[PDB]
Structure 1
Amino acid sequence: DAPSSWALYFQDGASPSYLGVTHLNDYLMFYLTFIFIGVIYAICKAVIEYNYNSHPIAAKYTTHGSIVEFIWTLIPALILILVALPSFKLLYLLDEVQKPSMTVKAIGRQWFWTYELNDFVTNENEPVSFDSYMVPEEDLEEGSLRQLEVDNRLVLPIDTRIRLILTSGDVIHSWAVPSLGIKCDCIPGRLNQVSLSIDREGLFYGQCSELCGVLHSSMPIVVQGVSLEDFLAWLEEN
């Protein structure tokens, strides 16, 4: 959910949209590692075994080939098809539309996010909206994560489809959370749509991924999944 020290591979996440990306990446790496090792070994071996002091006589009359070239052109095609089939099945499965039960808005202002929910508008007449500001270093609570903590963090329920609508007001921003495998661009004038579904009950961190000027490094994103009762209590508070 948060970066570790000296980490190598992905970080633990919880989302159906995140369980596919990592699996596809492992599948693709399975094919790519073999090619990498084979090519490097062949390149290294072709020189040790044919160096000048061992093979003075060159085979200058063999600069042709008609069966080797066909295999060269064919085998990579098969590899590409094999890798491609899941990469399309997963894409089209993921892009389809479910039946969302809630909606949120994540307007990306200049150097702070503005979250809004208007679904619950009723005789209460209090649509909920707030702004997320990065906590300064001096104000950090003991043990907190520097450069990744916010005063107000988005709160959502788990095991419930959510539809995120993203836009901006000043420049091009990007809402990005790797733990949930979400990355979309907020462009001023158009509403981008994304699907989201929390799975565990934890905290998830992220940062904006499109430079917006001088404070591109101080727009953290924090999502907290809580049970239904906790979400209802939190909503009633606001």
Structure 2
Amino acid sequence: MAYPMQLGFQDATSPIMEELLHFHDHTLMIVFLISSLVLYIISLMLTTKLTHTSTMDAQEVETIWTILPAIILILIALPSLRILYMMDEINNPSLTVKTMGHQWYWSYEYTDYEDLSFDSYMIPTSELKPGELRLLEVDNRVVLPMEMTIRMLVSSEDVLHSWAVPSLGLKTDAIPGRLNQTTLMSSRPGLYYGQCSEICGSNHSFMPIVLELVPLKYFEKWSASML
């Protein structure tokens, strides 16, 4: 989850999120440098009493200021598209889990073997247990095995929603009549939080996602206990 006064991304939970952090670092250096250079050049143009107000020839300089940006865009696009096609590559999941968005809660279906399904609602503020997080906790967490490739399938039974977990690099819209696929792999155990990410009405702010990542043997026993 996010922490107070946070400036950047949540720490990466998945290898793809790690990749996104290094790509963001590369891109932001470029944004910083260009922003700075424009501000600097503004200040340079504005700090002399020397003048030159006759017609100035443009063609030589326009070569520089098309070619250099084209090269910079290629240096962004190359690693950008490498990550795009890395996520898309065939991975062989161990487990498929469905999530269905509703106004205003998530349901989860684990139907590889048994018909396991349940609803996941925000814990009201007045019912939080000491130490628990306002607007983020749910009654029934999405328990998943750590260090395993999981296929998540996302849809809705009413309006649009969007299933997001920032620390895993995940955001997939939940569209009725459509079954959208994404892959989830956690490098670590723990609790990973997200929030509905398509405006779905009055309680859009209040239908969070909590993943609980545990060893396979714990997941298997939890699965059995939830039938």
Coarse TM-score class (shorter-chain normalised)? over 0.9
SS in 1 for 2:19: helix
* Corresponding residue for residue 72 of structure 1: 65
Q: Are 2:107 and 1:111 equivalent residues in the alignment?
A: no
Q: 1:112-145: per-residue Cα shift (whole Å, max 9, x none)?
A: 1110111123xxxxx1110011111221101110
CA deviations over 1:71-126 (Å, ceiling 9, x no partner): 112111111111111111221121122111110110111101110111123xxxxx
1:31 alignment partner in structure 2: 30
The structure with more radius of gyration: 1
> Residue in 2 aligned with 1:124?
none
Distance 1:107 1:136 in 2: 21
Structure 2 residue corresponding to 1:137, chosen from 117, 125, 131: 125
How do 1:54-203 and structure 2 match up within 5 A? 54-55=49-50, 58-121=51-114, 127-203=115-191
* Equivalent-residue separation in structure 2 for 1:86 and 1:75 (angstroms): 18
Runs (4+) off by over 4 Å: none
Give the counterpart letter for 2:173 in structure 1: D
The alignment of Structure 1 onto Structure 2 pairs a total of residues equal to: 226
Aligned-pair identity in percent equals: 48
Q: CA RMSD in A?
A: 1.2
**Distance between the aligned counterparts of 1:74 and 1:137, measured in 2?**
55
State the distance in 2 between where 1:237 and 1:72 align: 64
Q: Which amino acid aligns with 1:84?
A: A
When structure 1 is superposed on structure 2, of 98-107 and 26-35 the one drifting more is 26-35
Is residue 164–residue 171 contact of structure 2 (8 Å, CA) maintained in 1? yes
Structure 1 alignment gaps of length 5 or more: 122-126
TM-score, normalised by the number of residues in structure 1: 0.91
SS of residue paired to 1:108: strand
More helix by share: 2
- 1:222 matched to 2:210: yes
**Paired residues of 2:122 and 2:208 also in contact (CA < 8 A):** yes
Instruction: State TM-score, norm by structure 2.
Output: 0.96
Residue in 1 that maps onto 2:2: 3
**Could you say what secondary structure the match of 1:179 adopts?**
helix
- Unmatched 5+ stretches in structure 2: none
CA distance in 1, matches of 2:8, 2:53: 47
